[PDB]
Design an enzyme around this catalytic site. Structure first.
Site, short mmCIF file in Angstrom:
data_model
loop_
_atom_site.label_atom_id
_atom_site.label_comp_id
_atom_site.label_asym_id
_atom_site.label_seq_id
_atom_site.Cartn_x
_atom_site.Cartn_y
_atom_site.Cartn_z
N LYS C 112 0.88 -1.17 0.00
CA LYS C 112 0.00 0.00 0.00
C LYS C 112 0.92 1.22 0.00
CE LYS C 112 -4.69 0.63 0.15
NZ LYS C 112 -5.71 -0.30 -0.39
N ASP C 152 -7.13 3.40 -5.67
CA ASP C 152 -7.82 3.43 -4.37
C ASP C 152 -8.50 4.79 -4.31
OD1 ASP C 152 -8.16 3.10 -1.34
OD2 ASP C 152 -7.09 1.27 -1.88
#
Lengths: 459, 459, 458, 458
Positions: C112, C152
């Site tokens: 991430k 995202d």
């Protein structure tokens, strides 16, 4: 053939071939004609699209270039030009000449040139930064401290070297001698502003030493300088340091000359004042508004210094191209001038060059005027780039004194390469000074060519 | 914001901003506040898992870190810390300070810090080797001679530099100046043990030269030193070499002082003996068990040297933090002390610093006590790291004499950067010594900031 | 000496708790050592991002990439551009990605990244400039075999475009370095439908196990939230399977069918919500037309859960923490028996604890069955792996091929979670196995085991 | 200040013209900016090539690689060893490759390279030495994810071999860096048949649209030129589909069936022309046998077009500019209704303008329909992409698998060109849509759009 039309490059090639054919080089070394065919095709050319954003948020396209012409004697070395005329023909011409100039110095440097048709004229600082960033994004992968070390030229100053260096650091995550002409706090060298001008004088100090078997130097010599930029300013200051007298300077609008060319000289403070008018882009003429200057100098509007100085011993054309005519060359000879070196590029006309060399062949030893081309005598900028890369490698900065002493040694190498090449391949009559123009036009090629042969680049 | 809580880093930032806001820098260069926002966010942080095996064959996990804070002036340079308190906040604080300290030197070095929460306490040599091997396996890909050159700090000595260097060599298959503080046979420099101590004295020899316009030097000066480790020992020996007299040394338990502070001095043999008690971690006090020492020295248990030396000329606190109080600062001033430099880090308390600088502003020229911060005067370790990397680049080792002479020149650069920055941006009244503390707190930033601007890192 | 990372520390704690409350550490006690190794990221890159706004001013943001775990594949997980972004939040989201990615059965690690850059109020040119600056440093740490980021919050097809193009210019390579790419430059079919179809695929398997094949989506009333690609394709799938969709919603309110017992959103209605959403418009707009306003009630400022009446399946497909503990007890009181997420972390911990306590108290089909996002939400991440697979094959598979592999993936994910729960969290006879605890264990043991084989721990 | 590159400048001009004469820039006016960006190569490498001839003499040639565009994939396109080679000609051929490669629907950019080296009179050892020298510099700019060159004039399987082996020695990697490779070292099945089958596959789709499915190749008379792999496999395909092949030709002349109305080349005859061509022999040789000389007329110094009588389909499969404007008007007068190229740039601009003016003047099946090489000639380039795909899968697909994907590719290419023409170049009702203008737009917008997404322009 099928080859592209490259007039600037075809002319540079023809000029060198023409110099080598006219000498004894191919009479003694006929196989070096093969070296000529090989060297004349660059080892590598990168052309690349440059997309960047202007102040109006608009997409712009320019062309980017790097000619990596030769690396037999070191990594590719040579300037970047940002000018709307830029094309591969012009960069090939400049890059080809840069091989043989760098070689002539004695330093381990190849030759190269690159740049862009990007036009710095009318551009904001941020536009120049955005283009530099976009330009170096592609260029970074083809260059580096041991591969190819570009520098400044027309449209690439300290400002663009700054932006290009920052982007390279950011891309490659490395701090190295990837460019020269860097800022003093980030890998720049001392003596860089002074390089070309100081270098001009060290070169001629080597000529005076040789011609006069050591009996003479710059101490008490009368020196006519033209121009008032970097080259003229630092050449003047070096002449004064060595106990010489500079009797003239000039800008595009006229000549400032000492009224008494037997006695007087520009001082270092008079050079500072000239420097401070140039920064503020004013005319040298303006100084004779003050009382002190008016008493000591004549200003001659629209005039070059050469016929107006009287008896002079050294001439350093440091203004522009073709700034000494056949006529004002006879006037220097008649005035007892014995040494002329080009601070500027192509500063002497063909007529002036012919007059100097005709005089060299009809006068033995110290009674000849000896002429040195800019290729040879303005190589100080090149020498100090070498010294910047040397300092960068160890990331240890030299004193001004250490850089100055090495520049003087490097100029002695430029002088000796020219001398020795003349003596071998344009051998003068008994008592005649070897041709520093022919020497210097040949010395580069013979070193590059024998090195390519040792390295298997031709056989 | 959303930013992590970083008290050590927020304090380092606030301290520098507070120094720059208090000077004239932003009055003259308001745009340098942008440089401050940019520089204060590191160019790159690597955090990484370190898995290693202990003596019981058990898996261990620690955290590894490298803050690559700034590289405008060279490759990232800065120590490694192995200490259980280590975290990113602390390394960011140290790395940020290292930018401006390295910059202050004049050398082409960025700033950085890394290390681990690994606790060397209780670890076997083999555990330290296994961790070093595991640590460098990840770190190797982010560092190297032209990118990032770490060094020692708390919990990283010659032993850990050894293991880290070996693993790097084994991973990268390359021998290069990737670390400093190396062993003498494998790229270490001579004058490394002596660097900080010698450097302290060369710095103050530059202060004495400037303050006294050349009339005075270390020859005949009375020097009160505190501490007895590396810094104190080599500072003493350099003072003796330059014809000065060192009247004191101290450890944590008391002060050893010459009984006759007008006549006598520690000799080099007395320093050797002190050095041989420190290796065997004994107290200086122990020397007055012999008869020779007892006759020549007073041992003062629990006492610092400052009030007990009498008339002294130079003070070199080289023991610990906050080891000279406001009070013992007045006592040095009263004793005619004119030069105090920190061998140790933060050696003077705020009260002592205020007393020195209050005295500097109320006393013209040579009648002032002049104070120099450790940031400036203990930079000799940093200078010799630069010289180790210079030697490593060419893989040619200098003589002690060549390294010593360059360290002295580098300390003259640390001194002149501090002086010049004070004179520009904290300009003293007529006849007042510029502030070497303010100078030295500012000089780093202004060089890093103008370099970032040239490189396009802010505009 | 460790920094305080609340979100991360919470996610580690609740994972620990699920593993302790099982047979796992009884049977494999050495696996405790792995939890402490897995929990520290293999590598984290933080970097300065300097970029230029539309007034020519220098701006400074923080870039991050957490490379958490690569036992099972190249690092994998999305980028978030949001002003709340920090290492703590990315560690939390990255830690989760390890176990989500593991549960797809593909070779994908977890990670991430992103930036505290705030897309809000920014022009397309500022985003392009930020994406160029961001990738300029990120590129040296990532690659089709190393770390393949994706989209995202605040990183959509638009940003994936600018990031891809800068990666390609710098690395001079065209490779599956990023997923979520455009259809003509390495993108995958089913990528819009992946998460929404995937949650339905998973829930299909739930209804079959819970009722031993006696019910399906056929005739199920389904409350959905959200109105994006996830809520749209989840709804179109429910409808294809014979289910009835009773709700959709956007940020300003819910749109509920007046007759939640018998009535449904149609594909035609779904198409028009999607028409509105390309034009950045509210779903409220629709009961200004007369046809919609007769079929539907608009509820300003409400999520749907309390407002749908009796419902059989819930698919939160809007945002994180959109099912509170109260709304969970409302779903239980409305007779809801199956709940899984279309939105990333849709259910609160309070909601998950309510579902799991209900499951432990109610034998068989009487229980509400919650599936955790790492299992049921892994449809997008799954299709991200198939996008890498297509890029490395140099082909674009048909929609049917991508969809076939997606069905297979979500079935293997369901089966792993059920079988793992039956081995290590053996429920009381007639209790539905914990797909919370089954999935947690399944994903932790697949990572932990590969780490052991590879010598990351012993 | 730009150098004069006639060929390139012509190809840019005729592309510009096709786009201006459409709705494209009316609907998407911002796409004008893309034409100026697309037209400048991303990267060009020129290099000295020094090599040693069989007398031990040093020789010097110029090497080139034009890396034109990589929006849609790694750079892709052939190498040409021919004494006419220069940057101008390679830019022209490279510019075309962008849009050809785009139209296959695979992820391939466009490029072109080669050398003014002259294979004519050179031994196998001089070629090996030149190929070693050439790849020694080229290798650092190319790779299976960066730039995958292929064959062209003067670069056959032989040169691809020597180039591959030198790339492998220097890079110490075995990868799909080059296409057109031998069957045992990463080569593809259908690679010999790819261009010839592909032009027929495309033309099949033309005849179906033009006649709304009422005609096929079945019973069509087909004039072909050339006698290489392209003319051979184009003929064998026409025959398999029930068409009659009336001509083949080599450089010295044509071989025409005496009865072009009813008669045909057979697979047995094709096999013997291929037998001759491995032995470097003329097709004229064949009417020295009595069987052939009764079936066939040989025409010295002629191409077939004027000489075939009435014909339905023309497939130029010999060389560039082998259909003049006159020969185009002869094909129109002979009743020819469909023409596409097996040879690279077979049709002259004069020919293409004749076909397009005929198409605009004659409603439906009465028109001659020309398809541009970037669409119909893309069979080889397509199979080049499938060769990359096989190398990256580490497998060799069956002939049927390669052929299946080729059929699919040529259908998607036809459909894109027809549908694009119907949207942006909407013909008069009953006029056949321009596959010239449809294909040009289709290939330019797919590249231009991906460039926009990736921030190459805004």
């Amino acid at each position: 053939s099928n080859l592209p039309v490259e007039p600037e490059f075809e002319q540079a090639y023809k000029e060198l071939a023409s110099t080598l054919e006219n000498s004894t080089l191919f009479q003694k070394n006929p196989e070096y004609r093969k070296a000529l065919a090989v060297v004349s095709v660059p080892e590598r050319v990168i052309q690349f699209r440059v997309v960047w954003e202007n102040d109006k948020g608009e997409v712009q396209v320019n062309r980017g270039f790097r000619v990596q012409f030769n690396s037999a004697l070191g990594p590719y070395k040579g300037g970047l030009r940002f000018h709307p005329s830029v094309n591969l023909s012009i960069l090939k011409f400049l890059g080809f000449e840069q091989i043989f100039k760098n070689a002539l110095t004695g330093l381990n440097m190849g030759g190269g040139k690159g740049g862009s048709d990007f036009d710095p004229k009318g551009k904001s600082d941020s536009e120049i930064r955005r283009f530099c960033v976009a330009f170096m994004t592609e260029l970074c992968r083809h260059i580096g401290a041991d591969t190819d070390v570009p520098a400044g030229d027309i449209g690439v100053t300290g400002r663009e070297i700054g932006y290009l260096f920052g982007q390279y650091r950011k891309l490659r995550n490395s701090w190295e001698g990837v460019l020269t002409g860097k800022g003093g706090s980030w890998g720049g060298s001392l003596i860089r502003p002074e390089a070309t001008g100081y270098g001009v004088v060290y070169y001629v100090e080597h000529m005076i030493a040789h011609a006069t078997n050591g009996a003479e130097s710059f101490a008490g010599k009368r020196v006519a300088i033209s121009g008032s930029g970097n080259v003229a300013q630092y050449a003047a200051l070096k002449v004064i340091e060595l106990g010489g007298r500079v009797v003239s300077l000039s800008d595009s609008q006229g000549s400032l000359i000492v009224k008494d060319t037997a006695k007087d000289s520009f001082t270092p403070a008079e050079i500072d004042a000239i420097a401070a008018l140039k920064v503020d882009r004013k005319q040298i003429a303006e100084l004779v508004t003050d009382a002190a200057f008016a008493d000591k100098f004549t200003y001659l509007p629209g005039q070059r210094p050469w016929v107006h100085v009287g008896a002079v011993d050294v001439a350093l054309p440091s203004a522009t191209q073709n700034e000494v005519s056949g006529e004002e060359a006879q006037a220097l000879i008649a005035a007892g001038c014995k040494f002329i070196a080009e601070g500027s590029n192509m500063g002497c006309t063909q007529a002036a060059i012919d007059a100097f060399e005709a005089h060299r062949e009809a006068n033995k030893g110290a009674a000849a005027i000896w002429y040195a081309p800019g290729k040879a005598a303005n190589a100080g900028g090149v020498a100090v780039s070498g010294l910047e890369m040397a300092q960068n490698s160890a990331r240890l900065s030299w004193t001004a004194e250490e850089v100055d002493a090495r520049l003087k040694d490097i100029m002695k190498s430029c002088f000796q390469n020219g001398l020795d090449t003349a003596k071998e391949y344009a051998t003068p009559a008994d008592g005649i000074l070897p041709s520093l123009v022919t020497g210097s036009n040949i010395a580069g090629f013979t070193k590059v060519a024998a090195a390519m042969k040792d390295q298997g680049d031709w056989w």
